[PDB]
Design a protein around this ligand. Sequence first.
Ligand code: CLA
Ligand code: CLA
Ligand code: CLA
Ligand code: CLA
Ligand SMILES: C=Cc1c(C)c2cc3nc(c4c5[nH]c(cc6nc(cc1[nH]2)C(C)=C6CC)c(C)c5C(=O)[C@@H]4C(=O)OC)[C@@H](CCC(=O)OC/C=C(\C)CCC[C@H](C)CCC[C@H](C)CCCC(C)C)[C@@H]3C
Ligand SMILES: CC1=C(/C=C/C(C)=C/C=C/C(C)=C/C=C/C=C(C)/C=C/C=C(C)/C=C/C2=C(C)CCCC2(C)C)C(C)(C)CCC1
Ligand SMILES: CC1=C(/C=C/C(C)=C/C=C/C(C)=C/C=C/C=C(C)/C=C/C=C(C)/C=C/C2=C(C)CCCC2(C)C)C(C)(C)CCC1
Ligand SMILES: CC1=C(/C=C/C(C)=C/C=C/C(C)=C/C=C/C=C(C)/C=C/C=C(C)/C=C/C2=C(C)CCCC2(C)C)C(C)(C)CCC1
Ligand SMILES: CC1=C(/C=C/C(C)=C/C=C/C(C)=C/C=C/C=C(C)/C=C/C=C(C)/C=C/C2=C(C)CCCC2(C)C)C(C)(C)CCC1
Ligand SMILES: [Cl-]
Ligand SMILES: [Fe+2]
Lengths: 35, 37, 82, 172, 490, 37, 34, 28, 65, 32, 340, 34
Amino acid sequence: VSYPIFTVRWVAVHTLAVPTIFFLGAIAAMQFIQR
Amino acid sequence: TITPSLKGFFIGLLSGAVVLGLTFAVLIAISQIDKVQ
Amino acid sequence: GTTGERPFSDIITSVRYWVIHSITIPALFIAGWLFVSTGLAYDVFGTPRPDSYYAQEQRSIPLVTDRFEAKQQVETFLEQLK
Amino acid sequence: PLGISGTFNFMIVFQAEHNILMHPFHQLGVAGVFGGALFCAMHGSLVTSSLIRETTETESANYGYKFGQEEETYNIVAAHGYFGRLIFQYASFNNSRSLHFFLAAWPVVGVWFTALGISTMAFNLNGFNFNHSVIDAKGNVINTWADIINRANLGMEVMHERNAHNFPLDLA
Amino acid sequence: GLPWYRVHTVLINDPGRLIAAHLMHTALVAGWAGSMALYELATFDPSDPVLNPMWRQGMFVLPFMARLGVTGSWSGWSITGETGIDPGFWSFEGVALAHIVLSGLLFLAACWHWVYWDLELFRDPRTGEPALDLPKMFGIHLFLAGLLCFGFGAFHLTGLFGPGMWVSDPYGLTGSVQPVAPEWGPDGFNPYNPGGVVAHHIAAGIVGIIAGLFHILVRPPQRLYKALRMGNIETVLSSSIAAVFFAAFVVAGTMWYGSATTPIELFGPTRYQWDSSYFQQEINRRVQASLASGATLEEAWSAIPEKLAFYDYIGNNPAKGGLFRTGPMNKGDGIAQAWKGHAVFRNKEGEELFVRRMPAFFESFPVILTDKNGVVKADIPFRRAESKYSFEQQGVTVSFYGGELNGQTFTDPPTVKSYARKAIFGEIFEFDTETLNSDGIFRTSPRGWFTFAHAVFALLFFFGHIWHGARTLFRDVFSGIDPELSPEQV
Amino acid sequence: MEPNPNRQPVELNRTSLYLGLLLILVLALLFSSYFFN
Amino acid sequence: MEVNQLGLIATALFVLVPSVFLIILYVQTESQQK
Amino acid sequence: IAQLTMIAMIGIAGPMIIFLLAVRRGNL
Amino acid sequence: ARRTWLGDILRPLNSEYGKVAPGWGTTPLMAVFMGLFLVFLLIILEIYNSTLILDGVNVSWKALG
Amino acid sequence: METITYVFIFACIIALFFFAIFFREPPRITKK
Amino acid sequence: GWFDILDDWLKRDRFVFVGWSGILLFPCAYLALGGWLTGTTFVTSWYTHGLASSYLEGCNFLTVAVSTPANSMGHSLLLLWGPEAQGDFTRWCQLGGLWTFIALHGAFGLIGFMLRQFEIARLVGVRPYNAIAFSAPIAVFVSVFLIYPLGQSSWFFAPSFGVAAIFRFLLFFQGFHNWTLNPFHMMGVAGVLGGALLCAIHGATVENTLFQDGEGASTFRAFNPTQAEETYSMVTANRFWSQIFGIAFSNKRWLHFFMLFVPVTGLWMSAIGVVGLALNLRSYDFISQEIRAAEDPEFETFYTKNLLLNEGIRAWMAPQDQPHENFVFPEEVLPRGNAL
Amino acid sequence: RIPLWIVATVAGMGVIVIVGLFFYGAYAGLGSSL
Ligand code: CLA
Ligand code: CLA
Ligand code: CLA
Ligand code: CLA
Ligand SMILES: C=Cc1c(C)c2cc3nc(c4c5[nH]c(cc6nc(cc1[nH]2)C(C)=C6CC)c(C)c5C(=O)[C@@H]4C(=O)OC)[C@@H](CCC(=O)OC/C=C(\C)CCC[C@H](C)CCC[C@H](C)CCCC(C)C)[C@@H]3C
Ligand SMILES: CC1=C(/C=C/C(C)=C/C=C/C(C)=C/C=C/C=C(C)/C=C/C=C(C)/C=C/C2=C(C)CCCC2(C)C)C(C)(C)CCC1
Ligand SMILES: CC1=C(/C=C/C(C)=C/C=C/C(C)=C/C=C/C=C(C)/C=C/C=C(C)/C=C/C2=C(C)CCCC2(C)C)C(C)(C)CCC1
Ligand SMILES: CC1=C(/C=C/C(C)=C/C=C/C(C)=C/C=C/C=C(C)/C=C/C=C(C)/C=C/C2=C(C)CCCC2(C)C)C(C)(C)CCC1
Ligand SMILES: CC1=C(/C=C/C(C)=C/C=C/C(C)=C/C=C/C=C(C)/C=C/C=C(C)/C=C/C2=C(C)CCCC2(C)C)C(C)(C)CCC1
Ligand SMILES: [Cl-]
Ligand SMILES: [Fe+2]
């Protein structure tokens, strides 16, 4: 078939997908903070 | 009259309507761009 | 059994996809990393740095004690080099 | 003990000596129990709500079933149709057999772990002990909810079996 | 046939017997009111409005009758504590009398409407079958309500042609029935201003009268009549219940937090007044004032009115108590007899100590004494093995000012500790535990019970709404479903 | 008077009786302790 | 012991009343012809 | 110091010995 | 049926049964008071919750007498 | 007095048990 | 008319059904989930509870949480632009604005979701018993995260969003409300525990009472997605239990309704019990017991024992658990048994 | 076309790595005890 790209499903998927990776990145960085 | 907390109330009452706005704007628009039968 | 959306399976396999996300994914990652590593996050959320819970001597807690003049009270807590 | 309150005693003390709430196995236990009750409600409703009409408007909807029927009494395709739309299709059961296996597998597996928890903390391999983990730049101890939990535990420790202890460490 | 839990559906469309039913209910609710009254009148003691007011005697209905005017008994006494007053016919007895009769009449009425169920008025001329034009009904009823709402605020609360309502100062010491003038300003939206309760009923009453007419004239837009399955009485229910539980969650909130509508001299103190040491501050403020005008400690404290001291006792905090700790507050600590007086604790050095009060949260609390700066100076030890602050080692003593024990001092450890052990609950009082055979375990005030009961009913009613509503929008699929296999393809 | 046509018969099967009683009795076993308090 | 005086009657009517209810129905159901 | 070097290889090894089979297509 | 004095006098009030206005009738006008009420409640709510302070309105046992 | 009340209800539940197991409505197939 | 066009679009059958309800559900549901995930990793609870509460501070998935606001705040809605935070974001964070955010948002999110079930049910033409059921979880959330603290001094005593931060909520309730002794909590558990039984028991009864509709061992494939005959012997199941337990179902319609009832009723009861704990109207003691324990020092039940456990919980916890009370309990005043 | 079974085992190890980094962080970070 001739499927589209930007769809409603896509939006959702990114609202959770995008932030997540951004956090996993943030957290991964914390593993090195100290005192 | 119109105390600091009263101004804030408007700020939130206004910042709220906007969200409802852009939301129903966008929606009413995209809705009317496809639905054939 | 179907709707308009392009079957995930196809997309997660399309070399186009990876060509796009091999860039995008690590992008987002390195960003958040820097968010923490640059100390920016600490200021966006008023979260204390390992050296900012107490003032050198004090062993008391900066407990917010009244609602309305709270923000003001919090600011002063940052004062004692807390 | 074999009694209502006697059981609460078993629990409250257990927690103090083993900090069970902070143990993986107990958590899996509550997931299974919570989950069970959850799923028990899911199935129960989905099915009951997708029953084929065969009853009057003023007649128990139950009579619409006779013991020893050949065909099914509910539209498992209508059920799946609704539930698939609530969340999303592939996240919904359409195979009654796979549905019922899950329905049994979940609680039983979870409770198995809970039972292994009590059987494991029976040899003193207790829950996670995060007491005074997060400490600041000088060495001061920065409390977490894990610590507020320890105080509540000490209260239990320090008060259970008033007159039974003669020494410092509770090794029994 | 019908399952047990459906027997009442036999009325879903028999306007006659539906009214017969609703009539019987009203009869029982009115009946209950009448007799719950008599029960309180047969057990309520008016002998003392200061230390033994209705809210200490587990009175529940008696307060709602005072809030609107009825404050006397045909036997001579009165809620405020006056004598020689003539309540006239509308005394608690009168009110109780009235309801019992209104109930008997509604009964007879319920009977007639049951036998003569097939009045033509319920049959639609057109279809010739039973029918009720809800939309017009709602308009009518709503008209009458606002019309009555209006009158209540307009004539009753204002005093024009009525008693008024309960009004009291900021510390429930003066309360009484007084005519209240409206208030359309902004502060009339302040829950604690009586003027707002008046304005509201006049304005809302009018808005209610207008809106009723509208609905008596304008018809429901097809779109809606269809959406909200109007013309189907089992939907009038789903919406009403939603309103009824909304009303409920609100009355429960104003009872717990307080408002000009739930006055303390009638329902009791608030858990929040104890929390913020409300009355403790009003007392001090007063005591320090007397000392300024050159009075002695004895004189200052002696000036403090008993009633005022009484509100500063954790035993009137609705937050103390239990679910199965039944009865009036008196079966607990006992019938309050008198104020022993203010207790001042001091230690050998003359330093004045202070007893850490009991937070409502705690069933039991320790006796700890600190000075002004909050330094622990004395306490009652658990393990004596290494006690550094025992009342003994500190020479703690206690002196009283104003009240039964005024001018006296006590120094023998045990007696000092006894009182210290009491200071924890606030002002120390003298109870009569014999009479009611009290057990000394705190019970909650009417304010507390009413709040618990309505918060539950409300939360329970939510479920009714969700149930009946659903049963209205899915009447068709009720009993079951049928055919086809459409799902995944628009 | 005319025999009102809106009435149906009422029913409670044996199993329901049992399920009912089981509920009443156990609730009673659960609340009696607090009633006697 | 030192229990509640109404506890007994509260428990008795709590069991009787609804049980008597069910029973009245079951028997009237049970005796319906055919 | 960083024997993660080890894991890494012995780690892609498992999937490798089947991948090469996906190439030489046969016997999976 | 069974007419009665009172019954006839009230006969009009209950007769316009299914009578509905056409289309979206008064809906839109209604949707406005509705939104107004919604805002009205939020105000009196936020006033009681001391989130919206208004000199003149002192939400305590005080402001009484 | 309390003991009696507790044991009675218990004794009543066991009686129920009996009747429920041995005096249920025989469960009939197809033609029900 | 645009309305019906707006409708048309919404009720369109996509991968993730939107619907009118979604206009409320998704905005909130995402914000709630988002705020949690945010605080869990970034915001602290220092100015609020004197506690580290985020990954950024060193907390792990168990110890992290979005802690309640100070007790000073009271029941304040704590709006980002309200008298407290004053439009400022960082301050809002430090005053626990993120709690009322997650709370209130998620709250609407549960309304939207139930509405969804109701809306989707209607469209698909099935009965709404999935919505009735979900009233149970609403009640729990409503009574526990809203009604409860609304009865207490402030939001500070509502359960903080987090794993461990919830365990203390449990321990607290034992220690202060002696909640385990509450008739309603018991019913609660009888339902959840009993509900997780029906679940397991029914599942197994089905899988081991199946007809053979295939030649394989893995009988999963042997299922007719398209109705027809019962896939398991309802008649055999009846006889099994009727001989091993003495009692057994025989009306799938009832067996399944029962499964809705048991756990939904249980949670409803557990709610009422808490609605009562709001006013502190707890089921703390048995008066007849206390009276005998006072006069007679040798009378001891597993009940009295428990109450002592509570005293310890309260005395040793209160200090760091209720900071706003500046509690100071001298070592000599702390209840303790011998040696320990 | 990238073979699925590879998308998985790669995205898979990729998670054991990040989730494992977290477990290491537990004996070094601030969540340490040292
Ligand atoms: C549509 C779904 C939705 C809903 C129901 C809510 C609901 C809520 N939000 Mg959330 N929010 C949403 C989407 C939504 N939000 C989204 C998408 C975002 C991201 C941008 C946010 C971001 C957000 C933040 C940052 C905050 C909230 C907060 C809140 C809470 C209170 C705010 C308030 O007072 O509003 C008042 C409501 C209105 C403005 C509605 C007015 C409607 C009428 C019809 C318009 C009339 C307008 C006209 C100008 C007035 C004439 C009158 C005249 C006298 C002046 C409330 C529970 C606050 C909170 O959580 O506090 C603890 C908060 O700080 N929200
Ligand atoms: C003839 C009229 C009549 C009168 C004058 C009274 C008078 C009284 N009653 Mg009785 N009562 C009556 C009929 C009457 N009753 C009937 C028929 C019944 C049976 C249902 C009762 C049942 C009853 C009970 C159960 C109780 C009383 C009580 C009382 C006393 C306190 C009043 C009060 O605080 O109400 C409070 C009033 C309200 C509940 C507020 C009404 C407002 C609601 C929430 C709004 C409804 C929504 C509306 C439709 C919306 C549109 C309005 C529009 C304007 C916007 C008072 C002496 C109390 C008492 O002390 O006992 C002796 C009590 O407990 N009464
Ligand atoms: C709901 C409204 C209401 C309220 C708030 C009050 C409030 C009060 N009453 Mg009144 N009362 C009411 C209705 C109400 N009453 C009615 C309708 C009657 C007629 C029967 C009475 C008769 C009455 C008498 C005779 C007396 C009082 C007294 C009192 C006072 C003492 C409190 C008390 O005894 O608590 C006791 C509370 C409880 C035991 C809790 C009830 C909870 C039960 C156990 C739960 C039931 C659960 C259920 C079985 C679960 C199964 C569900 C499952 C199947 C799904 C208090 C001010 C006393 C007084 O005068 O004070 C000095 C007094 O002597 N009242
Ligand atoms: C506002 C008042 C109200 C009214 C007028 C109705 C009316 C109706 N309900 Mg609804 N209901 C309500 C509130 C209300 N309900 C609430 C708050 C809930 C949630 C708890 C429900 C839950 C509910 C369910 C689950 C069902 C109904 C059904 C029905 C219909 C049949 C009634 C029947 O035969 O019962 C039968 C009555 C009995 C023989 C049992 C009564 C036993 C109770 C539990 C004992 C306590 C009694 C005590 C005297 C109550 C004091 C009242 C208290 C509020 C002060 C009827 C139209 C039924 C239906 O839809 O039929 C198909 C149905 O299945 N209702
Ligand atoms: C604690 C255990 C427990 C959890 C976690 C849980 C969870 C869930 N139940 C659902 C459904 C159900 N549960 C049901 C009965 C039950 N559920 C039970 C117990 C649970 N149910 C029990 C005991 C019963 C029997 C009475 C039914 C009958 C249904 C459904 O129909 C429904 C479903 O779809 O089934 C699978 C799902 C609804 C999703 C949703 O509303 O999204 C939209 C809303 C969102 C995302 C808002 C969340 C807002 C909340 C209030 C805030 C949470 C705050 C943070 C985000 C969370 C982190 C905090 C923790 C660390 C403490 C959800 C997965
Ligand atoms: C403890 C109590 C109570 C209780 C109550 C009760 C128990 C009741 C009962 C009641 C009843 C039990 C009632 C009854 C009624 C009845 C009626 C209402 C009747 C009527 C009748 C008639 C009407 C008749 C007739 C006649 C005759 C017979 C002869 C000739 C002539 C004539 C015609 C007149 C109350 C709540 C109050 C409160 C608290 C306490
Ligand atoms: C006819 C007549 C008459 C008479 C009458 C009478 C006498 C009446 C009475 C009446 C009455 C006297 C009534 C009463 C009523 C009551 C009621 C109606 C009650 C109810 C109750 C309830 C419902 C309860 C419940 C409960 C319980 C038990 C417990 C838990 C909780 C609760 C609260 C839920 C006369 C001569 C005038 C003349 C004319 C005629
Ligand atoms: C080196 C060496 C050695 C040896 C060795 C060996 C013997 C080895 C083996 C090895 C192996 C044997 C390995 C393996 C690996 C593996 C891996 C790395 C895997 C992975 C996987 C994954 C990641 C998966 C995933 C998934 C999912 C999640 C879902 C579903 C599907 C799938 C399955 C795809 C020696 C001692 C001599 C010396 C030194 C050196
Ligand atoms: C708050 C807020 C906001 C927003 C925000 C948001 C919306 C966010 C979001 C966010 C998000 C959305 C996030 C996420 C994150 C995530 C994460 C961080 C995850 C992680 C995970 C993990 C780590 C996992 C793991 C695992 C599991 C669970 C299971 C088993 C296996 C494994 C191991 C794989 C606004 C501005 C409006 C305003 C203010 C407030
Ligand atoms: Cl013990
Ligand atoms: Fe099933």
